[PDB]
DNA sequence: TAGCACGCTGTGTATATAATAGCTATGGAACGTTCGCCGATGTGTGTTGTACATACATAAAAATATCATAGCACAA
């Protein structure tokens, strides 16, 4: 990819003594850039990752290059260990395993052999936006190499600590514009859209009488959000496109999941059921609407479903939802003549959550994506299958929300 | 006059020779029937001691957000 050689030209310029951060999309090949840099340096390279799936991907890249089984390419994890050799090495480690404090499973010595014997020379950190934390400062404080590299896709955080990475690892060298990359490769056009649904009177006065995170249980459970949600679901099913529903709250995800009758993936869920739901979403055309929480978004991103719906949201964590949204957008690439990606933000008027979703839309403006407002698409008035459209169901839902407030 | 005893009559017995008719024991082959003592040495289990792989509540980490309290500032 041209931008990858545009990033490698900086390494080809000076050669020795360099450190910086390279911003590349998730769908791009930053791991290939790490492989090329590993071929240019030829030394013990350590790749800092947070999940085993990324370790398996880096191992697949090592297989795409050459060798992995002979005593040279090592693997560090809490399950097994593998030997290494000087002058050339490729190993992937976990942040929580290298960090620690005093808990030990007779494996911290195996890491202190890679760090004690001084077999290093190249540092690779996956997702640098997570570095602003004490454990990563300890990791950097326990390592020292000749060349450092930071592979990440985003860096927008409101912790005011992203600027420290300019001296902890190095200043950002190349930031690729996702619009020009969309022109190089169709990574699904980004259509940002907020749905403005009216707010009922009872949920408005009860919403004002509530506060903190409890008023979210009155912002999400609005009947017009159920009507507009069903209208968007039936609309996308009529267009023949799969639907992914995001929710920062597990309770709302279970409510919409059970009322819509679709599979759901949330916390404390068996992994076999998660894999079954994933296979049903990949193969079965009857399941075109999935309800995914943060566990289903951080662990895996699927290239299907051009329809992304956002209902639940948390205060301040708008940039993280923009990063996950960006992961689902960049995950969809196949060079199509159309390829229209639709992001909907179900927001209710006069609520305290839309005013942060606007900050998320500001983050979506900083990336160059297109944003437009949507009050209501004509067609919901012709859907007799809408729930909570009658005053009876609205009063019953009001009583259910009041009971939910009495439980919390 | 009938059993008993005596004399008389018929039969089997052994033998060569042939005629030349049916009659039959024999060995083989095939189908249907009830039935099937103390000492020394050596094995033989079963609950269970030992043991391994996956589940699951814990520990912890890590990542973060929001009310309360002290101090400083402002008002009835």
Curated annotation (Swiss-Prot):
Q: What happens when the gene is disrupted?
A: Essential, it cannot be deleted; epistasis studies suggest it is involved in damaged DNA excision repair.
Name its cellular compartments. Nucleus
Q: Which residues form the Helicase C-terminal domain?
A: 227-381
Where in this protein does the record say Phosphoserine is found?
Answer: 390
- Residues annotated as binding ATP: 24-31
Q: Which parts of the sequence form the motif DEAH box? A: 126-129
Q: Helicase ATP-binding domain spans which residues?
A: 11-173
Function according to Swiss-Prot or TrEMBL: ATP-dependent DNA translocase. Component of the general transcription and DNA repair factor IIH (TFIIH) core complex. When complexed to CDK-activating kinase (CAK), involved in RNA transcription by RNA polymerase II. May have 3'-5' helicase activity alone, the TFIIH core however has no 3'-5' helicase activity. Also involved in transcription-coupled nucleotide excision repair (NER) of damaged DNA. In NER, TFIIH acts by opening DNA around the lesion to allow the excision of the damaged oligonucleotide and its replacement by a new DNA fragment.
Q: How does it assemble?
A: Component of the 7-subunit TFIIH core complex composed of XPB/SSL2, XPD/RAD3, SSL1, TFB1, TFB2, TFB4 and TFB5, which is active in NER. The core complex associates with the 3-subunit CTD-kinase module TFIIK composed of CCL1, KIN28 and TFB3 to form the 10-subunit holoenzyme (holo-TFIIH) active in transcription. An additionnal subunit, TFB6, plays a role in the dissociation of the SSL2 helicase from TFIIH after transcription initiation. Interacts directly with TFB6.
Miscellaneous notes: Present with 825 molecules/cell in log phase SD medium.
Name-wise, this protein is General transcription and DNA repair factor IIH helicase/translocase subunit XPB/SSL2
User: Which organism was this protein described from?
Assistant: Saccharomyces cerevisiae (strain ATCC 204508 / S288c) (Baker's yeast)
The root-end lineage is: Eukaryota, Fungi, Dikarya, Ascomycota, Saccharomycotina
Gene symbol of the encoding locus = SSL2
Full-sequence range covered: 363 to 770 of 843
